[PDB]
Amino acid sequence: FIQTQQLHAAMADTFLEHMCRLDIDSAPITARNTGIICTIGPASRSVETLKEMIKSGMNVARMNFSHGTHEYHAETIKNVRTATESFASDPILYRPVAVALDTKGPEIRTGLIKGSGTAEVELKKGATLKITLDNAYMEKCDENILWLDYKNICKVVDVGSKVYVDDGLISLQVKQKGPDFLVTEVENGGFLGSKKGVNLPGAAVDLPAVSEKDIQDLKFGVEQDVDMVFASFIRKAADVHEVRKILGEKGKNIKIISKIENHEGVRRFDEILEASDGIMVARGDLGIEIPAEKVFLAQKMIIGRCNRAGKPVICATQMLESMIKKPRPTRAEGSDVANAVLDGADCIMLSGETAKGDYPLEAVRMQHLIAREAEAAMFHRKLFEELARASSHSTDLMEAMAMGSVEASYKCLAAALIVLTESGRSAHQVARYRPRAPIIAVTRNHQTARQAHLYRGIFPVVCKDPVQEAWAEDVDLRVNLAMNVGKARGFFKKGDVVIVLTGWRPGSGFTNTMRVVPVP
Amino acid sequence: FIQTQQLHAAMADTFLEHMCRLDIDSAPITARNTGIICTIGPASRSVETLKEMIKSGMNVARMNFSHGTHEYHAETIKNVRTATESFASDPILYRPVAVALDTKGPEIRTGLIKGSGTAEVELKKGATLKITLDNAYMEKCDENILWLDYKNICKVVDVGSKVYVDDGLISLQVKQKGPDFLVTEVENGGFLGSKKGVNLPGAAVDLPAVSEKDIQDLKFGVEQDVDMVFASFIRKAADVHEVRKILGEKGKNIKIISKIENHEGVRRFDEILEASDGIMVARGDLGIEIPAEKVFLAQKMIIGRCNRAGKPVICATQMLESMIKKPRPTRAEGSDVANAVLDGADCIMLSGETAKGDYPLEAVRMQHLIAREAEAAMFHRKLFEELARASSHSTDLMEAMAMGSVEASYKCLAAALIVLTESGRSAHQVARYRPRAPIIAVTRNHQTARQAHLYRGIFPVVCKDPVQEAWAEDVDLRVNLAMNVGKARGFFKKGDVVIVLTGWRPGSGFTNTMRVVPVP
Amino acid sequence: FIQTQQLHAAMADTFLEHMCRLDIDSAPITARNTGIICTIGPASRSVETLKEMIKSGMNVARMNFSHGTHEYHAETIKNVRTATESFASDPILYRPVAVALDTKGPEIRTGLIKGSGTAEVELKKGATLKITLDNAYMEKCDENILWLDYKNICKVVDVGSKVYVDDGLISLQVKQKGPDFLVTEVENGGFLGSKKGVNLPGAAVDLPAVSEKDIQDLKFGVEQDVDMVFASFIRKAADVHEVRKILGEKGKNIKIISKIENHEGVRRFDEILEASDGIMVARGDLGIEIPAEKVFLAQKMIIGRCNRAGKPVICATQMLESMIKKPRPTRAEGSDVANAVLDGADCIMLSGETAKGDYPLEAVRMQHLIAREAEAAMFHRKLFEELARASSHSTDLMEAMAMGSVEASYKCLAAALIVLTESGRSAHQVARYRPRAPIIAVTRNHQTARQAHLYRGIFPVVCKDPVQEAWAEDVDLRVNLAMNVGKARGFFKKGDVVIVLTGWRPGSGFTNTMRVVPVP
Ligand SMILES: [Mg+2]
Ligand SMILES: [Mg+2]
Ligand SMILES: [Mg+2]
Ligand code: NA
Ligand code: NA
Ligand code: NA
């Protein structure tokens, strides 16, 4: 008899002994708690494919507005919703699917090489290269002078600073500083193209929070009723407030996930986290700005502080990169996904793997499989104690209900926690203290359900029955709905035990009532 | 502002830092969780005095059947019930009081010195002394031949074994065994009187679990409707079973507290504990049997394992000895009481301090003051974690409800936990996990209320209202009773938060429903 | 086979499990680490008795200057040294004995009742009592007017303040305050005699750190070559500095132990600890000033903070009080001693038990027996981690060696740590991290050897051999001397393993060299 769910490891006294007890023959559970975010694109925007994306485990469809027109993304969103609603007939097996808009964000771009968009020049290691803001050169870039569109650049870099060009492919060092130019030396050379991205490592870039294009896209996202916004290049709390402003009163319920992308974002993370609804570790752009070997420090730091605050955190970028061209991932990639879940990430993301690669369904299925194994391999008892330690300054009543309920699910090895919530707040607090059992959240709020995918372990279930007049009956209706969903999904069966959280009265502001109930 | 309840020490990371934070200016709360057991005797058996004992804090009246006739104890028991019911006119300020019978137990006795009950002889260190079982000498004891009444004594001692006479004052070493005699050498000499008690350190004494007198006294105990029995000289599980048997069906609900008094009882504690409803550390006799400098080891081992199992443990003997003749205790005694509570004892006991001393009320009031202080000074967070770890093999549902409730009570600093229970089981499990806030247990079972004092922190409240047809109205009735009691007794005021444990339906076997609820 | 030295409990994961593993059949080691401080008086001041005192365990002879002339105390001190040196014949078994001077300190006293020393009045509760500083009534005290000798009293008390008279027997409450009188109401009444001590609970009393008598006695102590002073009624760092100043240049090596005796001493303990060489928890006076049920809080706080700092701490007063008249202690007293050793007290003390009681030597022997048992029942692994955690602000090199040495002694179950030291500092740093094995400190400084008894576990050994020319030979000589002492006293035998701390070169300044060495 080998226990399931890495429960032998769970009983260890030390982290070391916990690790020593990880058992490849210990079966995980059916429920998968880590949300999977999929970037949609040419390889996956067909209604036929999106249906398989959902059945393969996609939870959130990410629209990258770095490219594509409003008409292009509108059609993808429609297909996503068409695919999503194709399962609506059976509300027991219906998976809510959320829509996320990833903004282009502010950028620094170079000019044209010899008036051409495809021309290139070779920069040689050690050579000289003057960066200019004189627009007489914006379409006349060459190996000796390079124009770019960030006019305050000289105000935020210093002599000795570095300028990266084209996703870090080329690095320049600022030797001299002038009124509207910089004289730099070519550290790493290579081929310089046209309208390439520029990164300024260490600089406090004073670009605005949103570009003029972001404002249009954000308004588009309001029109299209997106569930969340992945805001790019967030460097300070003010940037978040500005995105909140643009979304305004009509988008006040769309969640703002700040993408941490450069040094300042990491350094000012605490205030960014406080202002945001969630966080994305944008490891791709972060690894261009900061040294690559330091990215794991930022990831673990950010996930830890997000878990501490109970705010959703996303791990993104190149998690299964090799699966763009291959149907099986490398060992480093399976490691990276598992350690992302062990770190504490609420969601893991796929970008090129699902937007353009040849095996989008295999990438989704792999992440699903790894996450379930990593979820059981967590050291829940230690994790719970340390989260409770971190938040002990708070005497919040809902936190108390969450902690007691998660504590109870540990003790009796409950099969799930059923939480009735309209806003989702009660379910969020339960997910914050990291039960191993899945949280079945019943809501009559369709958006609450879609946004639930940002929190680890929340399985949203939409109740479409009218509110019963007798509160007790209305509670039991929704509880039995969760009971049926759980049985159908294979989360538990008759005779199992679940933790049920509800409101005592219709007027209760949170789930102030907890019950241990057998599954009927 | 200086925090109350040693709550600054409560937030410490380590046991050392918790101790360093103990603050004499941090006032304890009103509620006192530790049960005070008072031996009733000439100094305290009057109705007038028994009333002041209840007001001072007595929770259990102990009748010591080492002396006294059934008539004497019957009247003592009557005066206790008379004094107790004198407050029954106010079901809100009524304090239940338990009745305990402490059996005399089996004994080893010597004979008469030179035919007189008052004669004596001097045993000299190194001299020879023959112990005989020949009844020809049972009234011819002298400094050469000593008769005693335990006839299997030769079957349980060896050459080299020690024999103790007169509560350890005299000790002998076996030098020769015979068929019905022992040749001994005097180790500790002294003056030997008649009919002194004998102790066999290290021996498995095959004396019956109960004496003829004990069987009579247990019969009397059932007739008198006693709540519990303190069973003397328990050496093995079989002994506990014989007491159980003797009590039979008629006494099946009387709690059996095994007194650990000698080496074997300590060595076989686990089986004894499993068979018993509770334990008493009978330090007095234990220190006669084993070296007095080791008693604290057994006391701490026994309390710890009782805490582990959730079974009541009583610390007894000389806790406030000097107050038999003085109105204030020594510093060793004040510290002994506080350390007994820090150890985890459910109840502390008074023997001569209340049975015959000059200041029985001051003794009770001193244990009351010390316990409250020591209770605040516990390290609840670590205690809870370690109790959870010790019982994590169990998945019992009531344990899950209790652990989640205590956990919740810690998070939101609940002023109390309210438990609705008829048998008391649900409340016993809350107490087992040692919250700092008091446990207000509402029961319609008077016996359940009296026996609740065996468990740390359970304030029993007898509901005398009639059951209501509507389960919700009956629950709400008893919950409001606990509210009114707590407000009248100063445990909490309007606006404070409490944890409320109830059965979801009339047929629920335990308190499967937990709520966080503000005090109205 | 049962493990020794509670080594099974030592392998526990939690304090609960450690507590559950304490085993009365696990034999302790021969060496006793806790120092025994004996108050010498009429019962114990003869050379013959002092010889027995030493043989039974006395490490420090305490002279209470509360009473007695310089001539009387000088003769007692002389007898201590005569008895101590009667064993000097054998330098392998010789045991240094320290001499401590405990000052009388400042006092507040009342006048005579009705012009008599032997005459009393009854203060009925609720009556009125006027305190006056008018010397007219200094010999005319009665149940209406009460004189005392503290002229500034009105400046340190308020309306509502309390005044205690005759060691807390009588409690007054200041209801009206004049410029040289106080109108009080009697709270606790009693018979008031003449020239009784007064205590001002909670007051910032401004009596001098030392009295005129204290100054003469401290000077006497310097002439008498005492090893340490017990300074009474220490309320603030400045008081310590005054005592230090009085001892002056010639007494700069005499260690100052501050006696904490009232509220201000506990609240300002930190600045007192920083300025003191050591601390005494003077529980008797402390429980007169502060409510007796709080004393254990102050004891455990003070001991924890002294351990944290590595400074000696003494637990004093009424540990075996009943043994003044009885040859065996109570269970509360045995427990009090054990728990003081478990708290972490470097030394435990006897006062009247040895100074005037009927059983001085039985008292010493009982403390010796208890300490060894309690020393084994410590949770060394947890204690070491927490001490290391508390002191991590220090990167001291000798501290590093000490921790490394204790760690090593735990790992290989070393039978002893051998430390070569002239000042004792290296041995002190080892002692503060609490090895379970004894510390044999070899010193050529006789005063170092005597003062070493202040630190848990330091067995001092005076080297009397001249200094060898070859440093390596002089080291080998002293190490071997330690080996023979350890073997002679039964600390270890050939083939056991010990940790040896030495100086690499004669001027290293501390033990910078650690070796694991088998006993030859
Ligand atoms: Mg970017
Ligand atoms: Mg007995
Ligand atoms: Mg004093
Ligand atoms: Na909610
Ligand atoms: Na129950
Ligand atoms: Na040294």
Author numbering:
A (entry chain D), B (entry chain C), C (entry chain A): 11 to 530
Can you provide the manuscript's text about this entry?
PYK catalyzes the last step in glycolysis and is present in all domains of life. Many PYK isozymes are homotetramers (left); a few PYK isozymes are homodimers. In most isozymes, each monomer comprises three domains (center). The PYK ‘A’ domain is a TIM barrel, the sequence of which is interrupted by the ‘B’ domain.
With our rM1PYK analysis, we also include three new rM1PYK structures that have not previously been published: the novel liganded states are (i) a 2.4-Å structure of the M1–PYK–Mg2+–Na+ complex, (ii) a 2.3-Å structure of the M1–PYK–Mg2+–pyruvate–K+ complex and (iii) a 2.2-Å structure in which the various subunit active sites are populated by either a phosphonate analogue of PEP or succinate in both the presence and absence of adenosine diphosphate (ADP). Next, we summarize a comparison of 61 subunits from eleven rM1PYK structures, which were determined under a variety of liganded states and solution conditions and can be compared to the H/DX-MS data. Side chains and backbones that showed >3.3 Å shifts were noted; the majority of the observed changes were >10 Å. Our rationale was that the differences among structures reflect the minimal structural ensemble, which in turn gives information about dynamics of this protein structure. The B domain is highly flexible and adopts many conformations in the various known crystal structures.
